[PDB]
């Protein structure tokens, strides 16, 4: 037994030495976003938003217990989706646009069918294979989904059957965030262990683990390339990892920031790294300078969600002030 | 504004009149979070007053035409610091503690500190259902375990003046129970900035009047938050 821990420590030392040996531009400017829309109607805490693939439609999950589908141009309630578990912590929009997935404190991930022949948005499948609260759900294709839960597990599900094609069980804490890759072949997560992990979706095994943080991890999103991602943490810093380098790149913190990040979303070109924070406001970091490119200070409570269109036109933020602002430039 | 777009700004308004219907329901029903431990008895608390792999267990009950939630956090994991944030903007936190096992009493005190000093649970008042007081009563009536083993400061501690013993109560058990309650009020008075107070309570498994206690407590939190909003307090 003791020799086992000795060998494990030796292997960890080898990993650290390999990573250490492996390691070896005009500013964006003050970006301002004059809230071209302001999307009110949520009755309670907002926790999650996800863009549609058309850069127009948008769903937001709020902890009243209702998903709301809005038209980002004319600010209309396209659909109204009541739920059964009010404690929603994630939401997703399927690329086809037919389905949306929401998950929260209850261990289930419910699949909601938009483009139905009878008219009303209705359920498609309930996924019930967990023992901890679900914190991030993402549609792979129309018939596949990936969910990260409270118990130390990520998963890949077959929506038609309703069973995990593969379970991912390498973590040691509550998995908070989850980001499918551009090619839908990989995904990364942060799991309240200061340990972000990369996974393979077909073989069913964790490929890499990154340990830059010094506290929990709250949000994660792939770079639009698919060879990197960033993690948000309660230690008041964001970090940038590279998959192939298997290391840390940058940390996103300044001495005036005391509170932790809760929602990270990249830019479509990846140059702007928006980040939600506890201190009632967002920030935009130029993800290659780690500087404060600007502040989306428009909220009266903790930002909780953040996302950027597939066209790069706009970005939407929602704090628990029950408002989901939509932001864009000018001129 | 085209004919199809004119109907796009119309169904949006019929959904407005549905979200302005649920706002009345949402703000006319108060939420509560229940917290505790393995032998605390919150399961027995629910089983007593609810009747009058699921992540969260709901509970419905109303007293005097006011509807109350109570979210018992069930088949979750040992850690607590990421699903406890979801219970901000809640009316109160009920925190059942078993004070008849001094080994876990200090752990319950640590949990109370964590709830009380939490950054998001700083505007959230707590209803402490100090549970199963009778077990703590025989824990000292047939005195075999010395409380001063884990509590040397109990030696030079006397019954508080404002104590109101139940009829037919030995003074020593009064000393012990008010002692533990005082340990649970010390954290309360230590910090909080008056925006949220702690509400001690002497509860057991068969305490059949808990609902009024949550009712009165919640009325007190809302009265005091308005009275501070009016700078009257």
């Amino acid at each position, epitope marked *: 037994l003791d020799q086992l821990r000795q060998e494990a420590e030796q292997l960890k030392n080898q990993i650290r030495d390999a990573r250490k040996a492996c390691a070896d531009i005009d500013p964006v400017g003050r970006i301002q976003m004059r809230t071209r829309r302001t999307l009110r109607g949520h009755l309670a805490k907002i926790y999650a938003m996800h863009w549609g693939t058309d850069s127009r439609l948008l769903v937001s999950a709020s902890q009243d217990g209702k998903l709301i589908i809005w038209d980002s141009y004319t600010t209309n309630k396209v659909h109204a989706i009541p739920l059964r578990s009010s404690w929603v912590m994630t939401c997703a929009y399927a690329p086809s646009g037919n389905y949306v997935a929401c998950g929260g404190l209850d261990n289930i991930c419910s699949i909601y069918n938009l483009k139905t022949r009878e*008219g009303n948005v209705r359920v498609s499948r309930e996924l019930a294979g967990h023992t901890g609260y679900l914190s991030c759900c993402r549609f792979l294709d129309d018939n596949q989904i990936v969910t990260s839960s409270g118990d130390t597990t990520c998963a890949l599900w077959d929506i038609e059957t309703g069973q995990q094609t593969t379970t991912f069980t390498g973590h040691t804490g509550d998995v908070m965030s989850l980001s499918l890759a551009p090619d839908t072949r990989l995904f990364v997560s942060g799991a309240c262990d200061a340990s972000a992990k990369l996974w393979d979706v077909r073989e069913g095994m964790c490929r890499q683990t990154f340990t830059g943080h010094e506290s929990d991890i709250n949000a994660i999103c792939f770079f639009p390339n698919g060879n990197a991602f960033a993690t948000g943490s309660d230690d008041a810093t964001c970090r940038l990892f590279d998959l192939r380098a298997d290391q840390e790149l940058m940390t996103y913190s300044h001495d005036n920031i005391i509170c932790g990040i809760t929602s990270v979303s990249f830019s479509k070109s990846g140059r702007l790294l928006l980040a939600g924070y506890d201190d009632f406001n967002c920030n935009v970091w130029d993800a290659l300078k780690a500087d404060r490119a600007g502040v989306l200070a428009g909220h009266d409570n903790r930002v909780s969600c953040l996302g950027v269109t597939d066209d790069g036109m706009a970005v939407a933020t929602g704090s628990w002030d029950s408002f989901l602002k939509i932001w864009n430039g000018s001129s | 504004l085209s004919a199809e777009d004119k109907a796009a700004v119309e*169904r949006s308004k019929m959904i407005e009149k549905q979200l302005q219907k649920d706002k009345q329901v949402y703000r006319a029903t108060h939420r509560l979070l229940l917290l505790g431990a393995d032998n605390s008895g919150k399961s027995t608390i629910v089983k007593q007053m609810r009747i009058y792999t699921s992540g969260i267990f709901e509970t419905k009950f109303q007293v005097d035409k006011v509807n109350f939630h109570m979210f018992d956090v069930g088949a979750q994991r040992d850690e607590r610091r990421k699903w406890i944030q979801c219970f901000n903007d809640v009316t109160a936190i009920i925190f059942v503690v078993d004070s008849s096992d001094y080994n876990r009493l200090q752990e319950a005190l640590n949990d109370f500190k964590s709830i009380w000093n939490n950054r998001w649970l700083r505007t959230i008042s707590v209803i402490l259902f100090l549970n199963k007081q009778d077990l703590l009563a025989e824990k000292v009536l047939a005195g075999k375990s010395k409380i001063e083993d884990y509590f040397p400061e109990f030696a030079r501690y006397t019954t508080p003046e404002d104590a109101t013993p139940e009829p037919g109560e030995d003074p020593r058990v009064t000393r012990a129970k008010y002692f533990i309650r005082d340990e649970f009020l010390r954290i309360s008075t230590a910090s909080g900035d008056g925006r949220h107070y702690c509400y001690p309570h002497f509860t057991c498994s068969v305490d059949t009047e808990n609902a009024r206690r949550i009712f009165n407590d919640c009325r007190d939190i809302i009265q005091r938050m308005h009275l501070r909003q009016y700078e009257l307090l």
Partner: single-chain antibody
Amino acid sequence: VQLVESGGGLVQPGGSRKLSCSASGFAFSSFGMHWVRQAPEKGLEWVAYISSGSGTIYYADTVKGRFTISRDDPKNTLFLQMTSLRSEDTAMYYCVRSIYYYGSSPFDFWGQGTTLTVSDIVMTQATSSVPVTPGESVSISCRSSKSLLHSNGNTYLYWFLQRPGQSPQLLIYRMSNLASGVPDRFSGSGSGTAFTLTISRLEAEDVGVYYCMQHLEYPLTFGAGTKLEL
């Protein structure tokens, strides 16, 4: 989805007859309910319109002042009130569900229809009969009175087919889209005032009359109707 209705038939000439629509199988309360009739040998012409929420009601200018539309959500039914029909009111009527949001397909489902017989953009279809062989590419055109491309990219022309024995159906909505149970052969385009419908490879079930609807500005108007003979 099932829109079944009746009501017409025999009544004292110059009298009143109420047309219903027994909707079944869909979320009625969220849909807009139109009406359309058909001249016994000629094309269609709009009748009435009740919108979601029973707030917006538009009518046919020919009989605007005297037709009476209505609806009743909590029983998923519809009603239409005719009063003292003239001799021009000999036609056969249709019931239509429609719903309007980003990406929706209005006029997606056309009811089965009922007869009622008692004794402004304008669409022109000078083409009325065309011979064609199966497996060959064919096209049918409809022309309008003005433009239909609105400021938001839409085109507001609904292509159609009335199969030789039953009710119309959506082939393309807004000049470029496709319905639910419709093959991928169909396709259409618009020039700015004139349009055309293209079928890549004809088969047996693509015979009949093709219609054109605009929706940009009321009233709604159809074309003449181009019958295809194989």
